[PDB]
Amino acid sequence: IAQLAMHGQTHVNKIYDPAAGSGSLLLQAKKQFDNHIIEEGFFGQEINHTTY
Amino acid sequence: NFIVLDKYIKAEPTGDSYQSESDLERELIQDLRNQGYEFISVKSQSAMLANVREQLQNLNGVVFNDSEWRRFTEQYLDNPSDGILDKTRKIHIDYICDFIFDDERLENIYLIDKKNLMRNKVQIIQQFENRYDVTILVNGLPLVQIELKKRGVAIREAFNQIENSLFKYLQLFVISNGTDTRYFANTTKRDKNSFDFTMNWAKSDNTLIKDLKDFTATCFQKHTLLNVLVNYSVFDSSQTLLVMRPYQIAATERILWKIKSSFTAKNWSKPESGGYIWHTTGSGKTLTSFKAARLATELDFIDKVFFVVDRKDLDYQTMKEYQRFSPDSVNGSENTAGLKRNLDKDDNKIIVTTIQKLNNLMKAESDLPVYNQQVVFIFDECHRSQFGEAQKNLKKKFKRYYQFGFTGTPIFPENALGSETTASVFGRELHSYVITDAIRDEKVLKFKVDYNDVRPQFKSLETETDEKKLSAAENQQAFLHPMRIQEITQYILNNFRQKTHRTFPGSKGFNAMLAVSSVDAAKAYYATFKRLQEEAANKSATYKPLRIATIFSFAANEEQNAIGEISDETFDTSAMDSSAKEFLDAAIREYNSHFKTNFSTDSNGFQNYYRDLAQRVKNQDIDLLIVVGMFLTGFDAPTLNTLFVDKNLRYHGLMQAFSRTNRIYDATKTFGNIVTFRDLERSTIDAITLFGDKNTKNVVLEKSYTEYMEGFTDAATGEAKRGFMTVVSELEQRFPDPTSIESEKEKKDFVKLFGEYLRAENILQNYDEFATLKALQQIDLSDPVAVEKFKAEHYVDDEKFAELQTIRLPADRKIQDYRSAYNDIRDWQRREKDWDDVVFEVDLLKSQEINLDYILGLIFEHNRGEMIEEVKRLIRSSLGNRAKEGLVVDFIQQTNLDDLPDKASIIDAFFTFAQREQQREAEALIKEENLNEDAAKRYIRTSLKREYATENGTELNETLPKLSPLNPQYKTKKQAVFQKIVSFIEKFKGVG
Amino acid sequence: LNADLNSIFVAIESSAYGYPSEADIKGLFADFDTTSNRLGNTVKDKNARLAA
Amino acid sequence: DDPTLINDERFAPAGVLAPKSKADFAFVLHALNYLSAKGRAAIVCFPGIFYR
Amino acid sequence: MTYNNVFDHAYEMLKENIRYDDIRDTDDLHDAIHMAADNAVPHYYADIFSVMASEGIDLEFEDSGLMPDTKDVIRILQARIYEQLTIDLWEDAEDLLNEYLEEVEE
Amino acid sequence: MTYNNVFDHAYEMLKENIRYDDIRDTDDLHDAIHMAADNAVPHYYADIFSVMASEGIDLEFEDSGLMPDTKDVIRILQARIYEQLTIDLWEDAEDLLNEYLEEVEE
C-alpha cells in the first residue's frame, strides 16, 4: 500500500487515515520516504481505547 | 409551587459595599445563611470525610464503624484510579452503593435522595487556599462552586483563567462579578466555546436575572438548586454533561403541574386540560421533549407516554432519544399486535411513533386494553398535513388521554382559512419562547425591512392591499411587466456589492437570496436576469459577473393550513409542464457547464443538485439564489445577511423566512437586511402584534436613518446614542488630526472614539442613503451625462442632490489617515503588549484590505515621479503590509513605467522581481547566520506553505546553526534568527 | 412477593434469605441459599433484572 | 439510515446508502470525499462480493 | 462469539435482502438466504471455534455433499455453520414472509 | 482450557512414566510418550475447541495418515492435538532424560 500510494505526487499532503488501527501501516510509507519530502501530519482515527 | 417565577419582586441592596469582592463573598454567605443554608468551615480533608460520614449516617439511618467507613471510603468513594467522569457518573447514575455490613446484610447507601427534598441536606463552606470561592456541599459533597471575579473585568476574559482529592465531584461553576452572572457545565472548554453554553437564569418572561443578589434569591433556593441539579440535569453517554435552558425547565414544570392538577381535577380527555408550548424554530428542541417524556414516565399513575412525530423525522430522533440509555422508543417492525405487546411491556413506556403508524393502530384495532388508561401524547412537527382524523379517532378510541403540542406554527383566529386553531385543539398557551426573547438573549440578530420606492409608475400595484386582487392582478402586465422587472434588476445589480460588503475585492462578503412568486414568473425572471447580466457584461467589459442559481420542482400543491406559508414542493421533476422542464434542464446544464457536475433530471439528480446547491451556497460561492418555494425554513447558513423579496409572505411565513438572516457569524455581521418591492411592513407590524406588545418593534426591527445619523436615547433599555455627525464632530474637533497623535492618552482616546466610528460606519453601510452620500464623492462637475448616470442609478432628484451636496463628509483620504493612525496605535502597542484597557478592534479592518493588486493597478494607472510617493502612505493604510514596504518601494524605484506596458504586465514583473528578491535575500539572510542550507530551504518552504513561523516543530531546532540543546546558552541567536525569519516571511508572505 | 412489582429494592430478598436460613434448631441443613448475589452492574439494572 | 448520514456531506454521491453487515464500502465512499484529482487512493476490501 | 451472534448478522442481512430488494417470492428469497447466510459466517479461526464451542450447532452434517473429502476441516466447519443457519432461516423466512409482506402495504 | 492446560497434564504423565517405571531408554520412553500424550487429550466438545481456539496449535497436519478420510472431524482435531503434543514431548523427553536420570543417582 506504500508503493501504491507512492509515487510521483510530491505535494501537500500526506497522510490521512480512517480506521487507523495501529500506526504500523502508516509507518513504512514515509519512514522509508522521509527524505523524499516532508509535507504535513499523519491523521488517524480509531475506536478501541487500548488500540488508540 | 414552581422554581421559575412568574411574579417576582426584584430585591435591592443598601449597600453593603459592592466594590471589593470579599464584601460580596461575605454578603453571599450572609444571604445563604438567611435563606436556610448552613455554614461551617473545614480547612482539611479529614473533617470533610467526617462530615460526609455524618450526613450519610443521617440519611441512610445506619452507623458505620471505622472498618465499614474505611472500606466504603476506599472501595466506593475515593479511589485515586477513579476519574472525574467516574464521579459524575456516580452523581447522575450510580447514586446508590450496595453495602455489605459486618453481619452480612446488604443495604443501600444513598448519596442524594432522588425522590424527596427534605431528606437532602446541604452545607456551605469556603476554600483553602488568592481567590474568592464559595463551595456548597450537598450531603457533604462539593457540587456547586461559585467563584467571584473583578467588577470591571469582563466575563469573557474571566472565562479564560483556568490532588486535591474530593474536589473531583464539582458539577456547576457559577461565575459572576455582582452585575453579570453566568453558570458553566463542568468547566469543559475555552474561548472558542465560551459563550455558547454559559446560560443565565431568568424569570418566566425570559428577562434575565443578571446580578448576584436576585440570582441568589431565586436560583440559590434549596428547592430550586436541588431540583435543577437532580431533576433537570443530564449526564449523557458519553463524556457530556448537559444543563437545560431556563425556559425549557420552565415549560417542563408547567407541563408536570398541569398534568398533576388535571389529574387532581379529573380532567382527562378534555382540551382544557391540554395545552401547548411554542418554542422558536432552531434551538435544539430534542432535549426538552426527551426530558418531558422521561418525567412523564416517572409518575406512577401515568399509564403510557408517547411522543408522536411526523414523517420522516422518527429515525434520527430515535437515536437522539437513544443518546442517554434507555428510552426503548422504537417499533419499526410495524404492526398492531407487536405494538400492543409493547403496550404490555413495563418500565420503559415511551415509544416514538409517527402519526401514520398511530392511524394504522386506530383503523386496525378497536379493543386495546389501553383505551381507558392514563396515556399522555406529545406532538411535534406541527404542520397540519396529517392531523385531522387522528384527533377524531383518539377522542373516539380512547376515554382517558392527555395531549400536548410542541408546535412551530401557532394557528390563531388571526389566520383562519377555515382551519382549526391551536387553542381549540390544545388549550392554554402554557409557555412560549418567542423570537423577541431570542433577540433579548442575543442568540440571533435584528432585521431591517426596506420597501423600495423605485417606481411611482407601478407604486399602487406594489402597495395593493387586497391579496385576492393580487391574485387577480397576477399576470405579466401588473407585476411581471418587463420594465418593472428590468428596473428591479438594475437596482439589484447596482447595490449587490454595496449591501454584501463587497466594496473592495479583498473583502470576503456574503451572498443573497431572491424571493419570487411562481413558476411562470421565475422562468421569465431568470431569463431577464441572465439577459441583463449579459448586457451588464457588455457595458464596460470590466464588470465582474454575478453567478445566479435557482431551484423549484412541484408545486404550490395545497393551501394545507391557515394564513399563510411556504408550499414545500415535492421532488417530482416531470410533474411540471414542458416549458419549465426544458428551462430547468437548461439551468441544470448551466450549472454543469460552469461547475462541471453530473446531475440528472430524475428525483435523485434533483435531490443531489439541491443538496450540492445548498452546500455551494453555504460556503460563499454562488452569490445569488432565486428562491421559489424552498430554502426558507429547512435551511441554515451563518453567512447570508441580505434578502431581496418580491413575494406576498404573511404573518410567520414572514418570520421563518427572515430567520435566514439573523444567525450570528462574527462582530461585523450586525443584522440582516430585508429589501422588498411590495409593501409588507404592515404585515410585519401585524406579526409584531401577533408576538405581543408594541415594545417589540422598539427592540426587534430597526430605527430610522437620522436616529443613526444623530443617535437616540433609548426607551427600550435606556441607552443613549450619538449616531454619526456627533462622532464626526468629535473626530474633527477634539484631536490633533489626523496623524498628529504622539502621546499615550491621545492614542487611547483616539482608539475609544475611532472604534465606535468604525462600528457606526459599518452600521450605516447597510443603508441606501449613506451609500449615496459616500458615492457623492465620486461624481463629476458639472457633466450632466455622468451625473445623470449617478442620479439615474440612485433615483435622486436635484432637490436631494443639492441637499446632500450641502452636507459635507470629511475627506476620505483623511479618513484613511485616521485608519493609519489607529493602525500605528495598534502596532506600536501590539508587541509589548493603560494600553491594555480597550480591545483594539479587529474583525472589520481585517476586511477592506488591498493585497497590493489595486496598488499595482495604481502604479500602472498613474502615468506618471508622480507615482513615486503615492504608495508610501498606502502601505501603512493597510494592516499586514509593513515589512512589505521596502519590497514594493524597491520594485517601483529600480524599475519605472517602462516596465509596465499595460496593467497585467506590471503584476508579473512584480512577481518575477519579488521571487528574485526572495531567493536573493533568502540566501543573504541564511548566509549571514550559517544555517544548514538544505534544512534552511526546507524550513523556508515550510514557513511559506504554513504561511507563518513558530519554534514549535523541533525540525526548526534541527535547523539549528551548529549547537543549541545546551543549558548554558542564551538560546540566542536561536530566538534572534527566529525574529529575523519571522520579519523575513512578513516581508515575503503570500508571494513566490 | 410478586404483587410488589418493581419494588425498590433488591436486597429485601437478602434479608428474606436470612431468617428462613436462621433455623438453627435442629439438624439445620442451613448455610445454604448463598446463590443469589449482587452482580449485576448498577442497582437499577439489578432491580429490573431480578424483578423480571 | 437510522443516523443523519442520509443527509450528510459525502453519501449524497452514493445515492443509495450502505447496508449493515457490509460497512466496508462506507469507508471508500468516505474516501472520495477527502481526495484531490492530483492525488490517489490506496485501500483494501473483501472478496466476498457478487452484488451485495 | 456465540451461534446467536452469527445468527443476528444473518438475521439482519435476511431483513436487508427481503426489505431493500422488495421480493415477494419464497424461492427467490431462499436464494437470498443462500446469499446472506453464506456471507454472514466468520473468517477468523478462534471466531469459528467459539461458535463451534457454543450451543445450538453440532458437529455432524446431514448432507455429506457439503464436505470436501480432503484436509479442508475449516471448510467442513463453515459448511456446518451454513447448514444450521440455512435451517434456522427456513424457519425465519417462513416467519418473515407473512410477517413482512403484510407490513409493506402502504 | 488452553494448550498449556493439556500440556501440563501430558507433562505430568510423562514425569509419571519416566519416574515410577524407572526407564532409562530413549525409545521406550517415547513409547511412554505414545502412552501419556494420547491419554491426556480432552474429551468434551468445547474443551477440545477451546484448545483449538487457543495459541500454539494450528489446523493443518504434517502426516495426513493421522487423518481418517471420513466425517470424523473430532478425530482429526484430536490427532492434531496428539501431533503437537508429541513434538513438544520430543523436546521435553530430550530435556527430561538428562534432567531426570542424572537426578536419580542415590
Short mmCIF file of N, CA, C and O in Angstrom, two decimals, chain F residues 16-105:
data_model
loop_
_atom_site.label_atom_id
_atom_site.label_comp_id
_atom_site.label_asym_id
_atom_site.label_seq_id
_atom_site.Cartn_x
_atom_site.Cartn_y
_atom_site.Cartn_z
N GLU F 16 5.39 -39.11 35.32
CA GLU F 16 4.98 -40.38 35.91
C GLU F 16 5.65 -41.56 35.21
O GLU F 16 6.24 -42.43 35.87
N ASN F 17 5.54 -41.61 33.88
CA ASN F 17 6.03 -42.77 33.14
C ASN F 17 7.55 -42.86 33.16
O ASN F 17 8.11 -43.96 33.09
N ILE F 18 8.24 -41.73 33.24
CA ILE F 18 9.69 -41.78 33.43
C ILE F 18 10.02 -42.15 34.87
O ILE F 18 10.93 -42.95 35.13
N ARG F 19 9.25 -41.62 35.82
CA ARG F 19 9.61 -41.72 37.23
C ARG F 19 9.28 -43.09 37.81
O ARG F 19 10.17 -43.82 38.26
N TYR F 20 8.00 -43.46 37.80
CA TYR F 20 7.57 -44.64 38.54
C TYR F 20 7.80 -45.94 37.78
O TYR F 20 7.71 -47.01 38.39
N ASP F 21 8.08 -45.88 36.49
CA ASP F 21 8.52 -47.06 35.76
C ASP F 21 10.03 -47.21 35.76
O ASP F 21 10.52 -48.34 35.59
N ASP F 22 10.75 -46.11 35.95
CA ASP F 22 12.22 -46.04 36.03
C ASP F 22 12.86 -46.62 34.77
O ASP F 22 13.63 -47.59 34.81
N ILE F 23 12.50 -46.03 33.64
CA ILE F 23 13.00 -46.46 32.34
C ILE F 23 14.13 -45.51 31.95
O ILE F 23 14.01 -44.29 32.10
N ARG F 24 15.24 -46.08 31.48
CA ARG F 24 16.43 -45.31 31.14
C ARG F 24 16.77 -45.43 29.66
O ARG F 24 17.94 -45.45 29.28
N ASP F 25 15.74 -45.51 28.81
CA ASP F 25 15.90 -45.67 27.37
C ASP F 25 15.12 -44.59 26.64
O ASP F 25 14.04 -44.18 27.07
N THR F 26 15.67 -44.13 25.51
CA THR F 26 15.01 -43.10 24.72
C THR F 26 13.77 -43.64 24.02
O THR F 26 12.70 -43.01 24.05
N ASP F 27 13.88 -44.82 23.40
CA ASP F 27 12.81 -45.36 22.57
C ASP F 27 11.63 -45.85 23.40
O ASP F 27 10.47 -45.64 23.03
N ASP F 28 11.92 -46.51 24.53
CA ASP F 28 10.85 -46.98 25.40
C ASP F 28 10.14 -45.81 26.07
O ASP F 28 8.92 -45.85 26.26
N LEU F 29 10.87 -44.74 26.39
CA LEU F 29 10.19 -43.57 26.91
C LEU F 29 9.47 -42.79 25.83
O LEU F 29 8.51 -42.08 26.14
N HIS F 30 9.84 -42.94 24.56
CA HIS F 30 8.99 -42.35 23.53
C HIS F 30 7.74 -43.19 23.30
O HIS F 30 6.69 -42.64 22.95
N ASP F 31 7.82 -44.50 23.53
CA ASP F 31 6.59 -45.29 23.60
C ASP F 31 5.75 -44.89 24.81
O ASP F 31 4.52 -44.93 24.76
N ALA F 32 6.40 -44.48 25.90
CA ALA F 32 5.68 -43.92 27.03
C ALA F 32 5.07 -42.56 26.69
O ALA F 32 4.04 -42.19 27.27
N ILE F 33 5.69 -41.81 25.78
CA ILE F 33 5.06 -40.60 25.25
C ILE F 33 3.81 -40.96 24.46
O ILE F 33 2.76 -40.31 24.60
N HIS F 34 3.90 -42.01 23.63
CA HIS F 34 2.72 -42.52 22.92
C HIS F 34 1.62 -42.96 23.88
O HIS F 34 0.43 -42.84 23.57
N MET F 35 2.00 -43.47 25.05
CA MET F 35 1.03 -43.77 26.10
C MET F 35 0.42 -42.49 26.68
O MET F 35 -0.80 -42.31 26.66
N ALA F 36 1.27 -41.60 27.18
CA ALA F 36 0.81 -40.49 28.02
C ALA F 36 0.13 -39.38 27.24
O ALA F 36 -0.89 -38.87 27.70
N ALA F 37 0.68 -38.98 26.09
CA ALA F 37 0.12 -37.86 25.34
C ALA F 37 -1.23 -38.21 24.74
O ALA F 37 -2.10 -37.35 24.61
N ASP F 38 -1.42 -39.48 24.37
CA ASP F 38 -2.71 -39.91 23.87
C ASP F 38 -3.75 -39.98 24.98
O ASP F 38 -4.95 -39.85 24.71
N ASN F 39 -3.32 -40.16 26.22
CA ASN F 39 -4.22 -40.27 27.36
C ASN F 39 -4.47 -38.94 28.04
O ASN F 39 -5.23 -38.89 29.01
N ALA F 40 -3.86 -37.86 27.56
CA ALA F 40 -4.02 -36.54 28.17
C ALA F 40 -4.88 -35.62 27.33
O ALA F 40 -5.09 -34.46 27.73
N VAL F 41 -5.40 -36.08 26.20
CA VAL F 41 -6.25 -35.26 25.35
C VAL F 41 -7.62 -35.13 26.02
O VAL F 41 -8.03 -36.03 26.75
N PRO F 42 -8.33 -34.02 25.84
CA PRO F 42 -9.66 -33.89 26.43
C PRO F 42 -10.69 -34.70 25.65
O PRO F 42 -10.41 -35.30 24.61
N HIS F 43 -11.91 -34.69 26.17
CA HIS F 43 -12.98 -35.49 25.61
C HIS F 43 -14.27 -34.72 25.38
O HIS F 43 -15.07 -35.15 24.53
N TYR F 44 -14.51 -33.62 26.08
CA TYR F 44 -15.66 -32.78 25.80
C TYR F 44 -15.46 -32.05 24.48
O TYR F 44 -14.33 -31.87 24.01
N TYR F 45 -16.57 -31.64 23.86
CA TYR F 45 -16.51 -30.88 22.62
C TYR F 45 -15.85 -29.52 22.85
O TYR F 45 -14.81 -29.21 22.26
N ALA F 46 -16.45 -28.71 23.73
CA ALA F 46 -15.98 -27.35 23.97
C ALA F 46 -14.59 -27.32 24.58
O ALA F 46 -13.83 -26.38 24.33
N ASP F 47 -14.21 -28.35 25.33
CA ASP F 47 -12.85 -28.42 25.85
C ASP F 47 -11.83 -28.76 24.78
O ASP F 47 -10.64 -28.47 24.96
N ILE F 48 -12.25 -29.36 23.67
CA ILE F 48 -11.35 -29.52 22.53
C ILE F 48 -11.28 -28.23 21.73
O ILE F 48 -10.19 -27.77 21.36
N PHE F 49 -12.43 -27.60 21.47
CA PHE F 49 -12.44 -26.39 20.66
C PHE F 49 -11.80 -25.20 21.38
O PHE F 49 -11.32 -24.28 20.71
N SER F 50 -11.78 -25.20 22.72
CA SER F 50 -11.07 -24.16 23.45
C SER F 50 -9.57 -24.28 23.27
O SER F 50 -8.87 -23.26 23.21
N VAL F 51 -9.05 -25.50 23.18
CA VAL F 51 -7.63 -25.68 22.89
C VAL F 51 -7.36 -25.35 21.42
O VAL F 51 -6.32 -24.77 21.08
N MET F 52 -8.31 -25.67 20.54
CA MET F 52 -8.16 -25.33 19.13
C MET F 52 -8.24 -23.83 18.90
O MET F 52 -7.57 -23.30 18.01
N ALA F 53 -9.06 -23.13 19.69
CA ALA F 53 -9.10 -21.68 19.61
C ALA F 53 -7.93 -21.01 20.31
O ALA F 53 -7.72 -19.81 20.12
N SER F 54 -7.17 -21.75 21.12
CA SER F 54 -6.03 -21.19 21.82
C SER F 54 -4.83 -21.09 20.88
O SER F 54 -4.90 -21.40 19.69
N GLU F 55 -3.70 -20.67 21.44
CA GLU F 55 -2.48 -20.47 20.66
C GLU F 55 -1.74 -21.79 20.51
O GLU F 55 -2.22 -22.86 20.90
N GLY F 56 -0.55 -21.74 19.92
CA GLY F 56 0.30 -22.90 19.78
C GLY F 56 -0.09 -23.82 18.65
O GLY F 56 0.65 -23.96 17.67
N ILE F 57 -1.25 -24.45 18.76
CA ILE F 57 -1.69 -25.43 17.78
C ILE F 57 -2.21 -24.72 16.54
O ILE F 57 -2.71 -23.58 16.61
N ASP F 58 -2.05 -25.36 15.39
CA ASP F 58 -2.62 -24.91 14.13
C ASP F 58 -3.62 -25.95 13.65
O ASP F 58 -3.87 -26.96 14.31
N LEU F 59 -4.20 -25.71 12.48
CA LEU F 59 -5.17 -26.65 11.92
C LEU F 59 -4.51 -27.81 11.19
O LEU F 59 -4.94 -28.96 11.35
N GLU F 60 -3.47 -27.55 10.41
CA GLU F 60 -3.01 -28.48 9.40
C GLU F 60 -2.03 -29.50 9.96
O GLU F 60 -1.19 -29.17 10.81
N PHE F 61 -2.14 -30.73 9.48
CA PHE F 61 -1.21 -31.80 9.82
C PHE F 61 0.14 -31.61 9.15
O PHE F 61 0.35 -30.69 8.35
N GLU F 62 1.06 -32.50 9.50
CA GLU F 62 2.19 -32.82 8.64
C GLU F 62 2.03 -34.20 8.00
O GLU F 62 2.25 -34.35 6.80
N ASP F 63 1.63 -35.19 8.79
CA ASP F 63 1.27 -36.51 8.28
C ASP F 63 -0.25 -36.54 8.14
O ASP F 63 -0.97 -36.45 9.13
N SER F 64 -0.72 -36.69 6.91
CA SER F 64 -2.15 -36.89 6.67
C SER F 64 -2.60 -38.31 7.00
O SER F 64 -3.81 -38.57 6.95
N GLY F 65 -1.68 -39.21 7.33
CA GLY F 65 -2.04 -40.53 7.82
C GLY F 65 -2.68 -40.53 9.18
O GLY F 65 -3.32 -41.52 9.55
N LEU F 66 -2.53 -39.44 9.94
CA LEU F 66 -3.28 -39.28 11.18
C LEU F 66 -4.75 -38.98 10.92
O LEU F 66 -5.58 -39.09 11.83
N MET F 67 -5.10 -38.60 9.69
CA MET F 67 -6.48 -38.28 9.36
C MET F 67 -7.24 -39.51 8.90
O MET F 67 -6.83 -40.17 7.94
N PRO F 68 -8.34 -39.87 9.55
CA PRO F 68 -9.32 -40.77 8.93
C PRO F 68 -10.10 -40.02 7.86
O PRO F 68 -10.80 -39.04 8.15
N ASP F 69 -9.99 -40.48 6.61
CA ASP F 69 -10.52 -39.75 5.46
C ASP F 69 -12.03 -39.96 5.40
O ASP F 69 -12.56 -40.69 4.55
N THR F 70 -12.74 -39.30 6.32
CA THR F 70 -14.16 -39.53 6.55
C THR F 70 -14.72 -38.32 7.30
O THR F 70 -14.05 -37.28 7.42
N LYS F 71 -15.94 -38.46 7.82
CA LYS F 71 -16.62 -37.40 8.57
C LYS F 71 -16.09 -37.19 9.98
O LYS F 71 -16.60 -36.33 10.69
N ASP F 72 -15.09 -37.96 10.41
CA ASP F 72 -14.62 -37.93 11.79
C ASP F 72 -13.72 -36.71 11.99
O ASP F 72 -12.49 -36.80 12.04
N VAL F 73 -14.36 -35.55 12.13
CA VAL F 73 -13.65 -34.29 12.27
C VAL F 73 -12.97 -34.20 13.63
O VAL F 73 -11.84 -33.71 13.75
N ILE F 74 -13.65 -34.68 14.67
CA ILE F 74 -13.10 -34.62 16.02
C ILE F 74 -11.90 -35.56 16.16
O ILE F 74 -10.97 -35.28 16.92
N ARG F 75 -11.86 -36.64 15.37
CA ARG F 75 -10.68 -37.48 15.32
C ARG F 75 -9.50 -36.74 14.70
O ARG F 75 -8.36 -36.90 15.15
N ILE F 76 -9.77 -35.91 13.69
CA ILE F 76 -8.72 -35.11 13.06
C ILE F 76 -8.18 -34.07 14.03
O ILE F 76 -6.97 -33.86 14.14
N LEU F 77 -9.08 -33.42 14.77
CA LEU F 77 -8.67 -32.42 15.76
C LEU F 77 -7.87 -33.06 16.89
O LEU F 77 -6.85 -32.52 17.32
N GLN F 78 -8.33 -34.22 17.35
CA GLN F 78 -7.62 -34.97 18.38
C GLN F 78 -6.26 -35.45 17.90
O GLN F 78 -5.29 -35.46 18.67
N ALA F 79 -6.15 -35.81 16.62
CA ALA F 79 -4.86 -36.20 16.06
C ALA F 79 -3.92 -35.02 15.94
O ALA F 79 -2.71 -35.17 16.11
N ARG F 80 -4.46 -33.83 15.65
CA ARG F 80 -3.61 -32.63 15.62
C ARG F 80 -3.10 -32.28 17.01
O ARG F 80 -1.94 -31.88 17.17
N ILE F 81 -3.97 -32.41 18.02
CA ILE F 81 -3.56 -32.25 19.41
C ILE F 81 -2.47 -33.25 19.76
O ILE F 81 -1.45 -32.89 20.36
N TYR F 82 -2.66 -34.51 19.35
CA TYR F 82 -1.68 -35.56 19.60
C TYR F 82 -0.36 -35.26 18.92
O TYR F 82 0.70 -35.48 19.51
N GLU F 83 -0.40 -34.72 17.70
CA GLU F 83 0.84 -34.47 16.97
C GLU F 83 1.62 -33.31 17.58
O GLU F 83 2.85 -33.41 17.74
N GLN F 84 0.93 -32.22 17.93
CA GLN F 84 1.58 -31.09 18.58
C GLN F 84 2.17 -31.49 19.93
O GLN F 84 3.30 -31.12 20.27
N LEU F 85 1.43 -32.31 20.68
CA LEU F 85 1.92 -32.77 21.97
C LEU F 85 3.09 -33.74 21.82
O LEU F 85 4.01 -33.71 22.63
N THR F 86 3.09 -34.57 20.78
CA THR F 86 4.23 -35.46 20.59
C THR F 86 5.48 -34.71 20.17
O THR F 86 6.58 -35.11 20.56
N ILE F 87 5.34 -33.61 19.41
CA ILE F 87 6.52 -32.80 19.09
C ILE F 87 7.07 -32.11 20.34
O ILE F 87 8.28 -32.14 20.62
N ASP F 88 6.17 -31.51 21.13
CA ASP F 88 6.59 -30.87 22.37
C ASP F 88 7.15 -31.87 23.37
O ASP F 88 8.04 -31.52 24.15
N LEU F 89 6.72 -33.12 23.31
CA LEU F 89 7.30 -34.13 24.18
C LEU F 89 8.52 -34.82 23.58
O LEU F 89 9.25 -35.46 24.33
N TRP F 90 8.77 -34.71 22.27
CA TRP F 90 10.12 -34.95 21.77
C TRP F 90 11.11 -34.02 22.47
O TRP F 90 12.12 -34.48 23.04
N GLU F 91 10.81 -32.72 22.43
CA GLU F 91 11.69 -31.75 23.09
C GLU F 91 11.73 -31.96 24.60
O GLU F 91 12.80 -31.89 25.23
N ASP F 92 10.58 -32.28 25.19
CA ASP F 92 10.50 -32.47 26.63
C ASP F 92 11.21 -33.75 27.07
O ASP F 92 11.80 -33.77 28.15
N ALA F 93 11.18 -34.81 26.26
CA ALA F 93 11.88 -36.03 26.61
C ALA F 93 13.38 -35.86 26.47
O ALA F 93 14.14 -36.35 27.30
N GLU F 94 13.82 -35.14 25.43
CA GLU F 94 15.24 -34.85 25.31
C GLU F 94 15.74 -33.92 26.41
O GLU F 94 16.93 -33.94 26.72
N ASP F 95 14.85 -33.13 27.01
CA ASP F 95 15.20 -32.44 28.25
C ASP F 95 15.26 -33.42 29.42
O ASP F 95 16.29 -33.56 30.09
N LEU F 96 14.15 -34.12 29.68
CA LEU F 96 13.94 -34.83 30.94
C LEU F 96 14.73 -36.12 31.05
O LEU F 96 14.82 -36.66 32.15
N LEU F 97 15.28 -36.65 29.95
CA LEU F 97 16.20 -37.78 30.06
C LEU F 97 17.45 -37.39 30.85
O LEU F 97 17.71 -37.92 31.93
N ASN F 98 18.21 -36.44 30.33
CA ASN F 98 19.39 -35.98 31.04
C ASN F 98 19.07 -35.10 32.24
O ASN F 98 19.95 -34.88 33.07
N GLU F 99 17.83 -34.61 32.35
CA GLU F 99 17.45 -33.90 33.56
C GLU F 99 17.12 -34.85 34.70
O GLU F 99 17.49 -34.60 35.85
N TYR F 100 16.45 -35.96 34.40
CA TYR F 100 15.95 -36.86 35.44
C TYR F 100 16.92 -37.99 35.76
O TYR F 100 17.07 -38.34 36.93
N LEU F 101 17.55 -38.59 34.75
CA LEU F 101 18.38 -39.76 35.01
C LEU F 101 19.69 -39.38 35.71
O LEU F 101 20.28 -40.23 36.38
N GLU F 102 20.13 -38.14 35.56
CA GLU F 102 21.19 -37.63 36.42
C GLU F 102 20.69 -37.38 37.83
O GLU F 102 21.47 -37.49 38.79
N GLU F 103 19.41 -37.06 37.98
CA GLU F 103 18.85 -36.80 39.30
C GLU F 103 18.67 -38.08 40.10
O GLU F 103 18.95 -38.10 41.30
N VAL F 104 18.24 -39.17 39.46
CA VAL F 104 18.11 -40.46 40.16
C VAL F 104 19.48 -41.12 40.11
O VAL F 104 19.82 -41.91 39.23
N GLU F 105 20.30 -40.79 41.10
CA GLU F 105 21.55 -41.49 41.35
C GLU F 105 21.77 -41.42 42.87
O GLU F 105 22.34 -40.46 43.39
#
